[PDB]
Amino acid sequence: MRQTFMANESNIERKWYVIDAEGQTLGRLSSEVASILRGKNKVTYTPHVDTGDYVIVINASKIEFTGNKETDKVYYRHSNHPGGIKSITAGELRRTNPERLIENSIKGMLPSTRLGEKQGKKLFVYGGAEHPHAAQQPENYELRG
Amino acid sequence: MKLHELKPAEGSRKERNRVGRGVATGNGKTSGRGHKGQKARSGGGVRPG
């Protein structure tokens, strides 16, 4: 138990990032975003505290799918009522409520712990060029190739 | 020898084995008899020969 550094809220510094979803594939942007807001790009990563940064995804209506999973790739959900299952294709989610699409794609790549939910709360997705978070002074973030 | 320092002959005495007292002794539950059948019953076993 000798000398491993542990981060706590008294020395965590979270920053803000904008990520453009124009011309990017759903899963490949989502995995990198999940890595950012988990805090895994930080040298000071600590698994029991929420190190990591806030992320804004701005365009999010320009996200693309390979193949033909626009018409395939159906999202199902149950209402907890008998026969209470309904579905929406990925293309319909993109044209109506594209913020939910990217939110859910990134959220599914985060752990289902309490920390995971808290970290997924640091994600703000907008289906259009503009965001209201100018007071937070975000920096543009380019996705790794 | 003295009556407060008396010693038996080495190798003459040995503690007897008490059976069915805990599992660290090795003879705890079934007491060295295995599990079932005549051999496990009290007064079980069969006439010699």
Binding site: R2, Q3 | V23, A24, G28, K29
Partner: protein
Amino acid sequence: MFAIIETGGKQIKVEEGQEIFVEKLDVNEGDTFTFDKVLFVGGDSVKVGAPTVEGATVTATVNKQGRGKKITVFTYKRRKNSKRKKGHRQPYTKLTIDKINA
């Protein structure tokens, strides 16, 4: 002013004035120990040793050769009348670094 020493089967990052706890060494209380396996020196001037740095002894004063807090190792198999219990207390040596050499 910041060095990496190799002792026990481990490595420890030390700077002068620090108290370290290592696997038991063969010294007495109040003696001086010299670590001669130094892999890295930091601070303003950096010496990155391939195996060791070559030279760079680290001297320390040894105090309180002791035994750690008692662990009680216990294990049991479930429906088999099998369990084992035994204590353990690791010996350790407490040293205080007083010189990083290079």
